[PDB]
């Protein structure tokens with residue numbers, strides 16, 4: 001095609017992310033009259049999300065996914081998006097990004113500094129904790145060998161609840177669980193399904209600890225080359241895809257209990273009061289490290305009423 005473009009992702013071919021990206025690619029092909037074709041590169045073929053964000057910056061990859069929280073790699077205060085238990089729900093995640101001074105200035109920085117244009121935001125689920133033994137309370141987290149992604153906020157979740165974290169890439173997790181090299185991991189229900197972690201984890205605990213969004217990102221090097229009518233095709237398609245993406249996750253969160261129980265998984269509901277209390281020193285550390293900018297981001301986000 002005139003524009004043979006590429007969309008990379010960590011998520012695999014059975015995932016909601018991939019299904020929504022498929023929708024995006026199909027609409028862009030159709031509505032561009034075939035001028036743009038977007039091919040998909042799932043399962044970390046191109047590297048992880050850190051690597052793929054660098055590829056958007058350089059222009060060697062056209063589209064990718066990231067969370068708002070991922071930008072804590074560049075702007076430490078943006079860890080606010082993934083401080084456990086701070087963001088109540090997706091409604092808060094949306095307003096935090098688009099309707100705070102903090103969020104709006106982040107979007108502008110992603111463009112100016114990082115060479116990426118934010119097309120749309122979707123919901124990517126609320127992370128829960130799977131394991132090879134029951135988590136009936138916070139006591140069961142003590143010394144649990146808990147895999148985490150290579151992200152500071154997930155590492156801190158594991159540390160402050162009393163677990164023993166092992167960072168590793170998403171692609172490596174299934175084998176780590178299967179072999180019991182680690183005891184557990186944490187991800188939204190949809191990812192537990194998509195990666196088939198239920199095959200290698202007997203237990204799931206509703207820790208409700210971090211809320212993931214999902215940003216549809218384009219490389220400025222690519223977006224600048226598209227005539228403006230095709231830019232609009234791409235933006236409109238990303239917006240349509242994000243709405244579908246969010247629905248896939250919302251529907252799955254009300255539907256997946258039946259699925260996991262049918263697969264033999266035991267689901268627990270530990271008291272979250274001590275999980276939340278265990279985070280108080282982390283929040284203090286975040287404020288110490290990120291200073292006024294972090295205190296401000298937290299104030300702005302904690303001001304958002306969670307009720308639609």
Ligand SMILES: O=C(CO)N[C@H]1[C@H]([C@H](O)[C@H](O)CO)O[C@](O)(C(=O)O)C[C@@H]1O
Pocket residue numbers: 009010011048049065066067069070148149150151169170186187191212214215
């Ligand atoms: O790659 C992205 C893009 O948002 N998100 C990945 C996500 C992400 O890299 C982390 O939440 C850090 O922001 O990590 C996982 O949840 C995981 O490795 O458990 C996989 C998920 O696909």
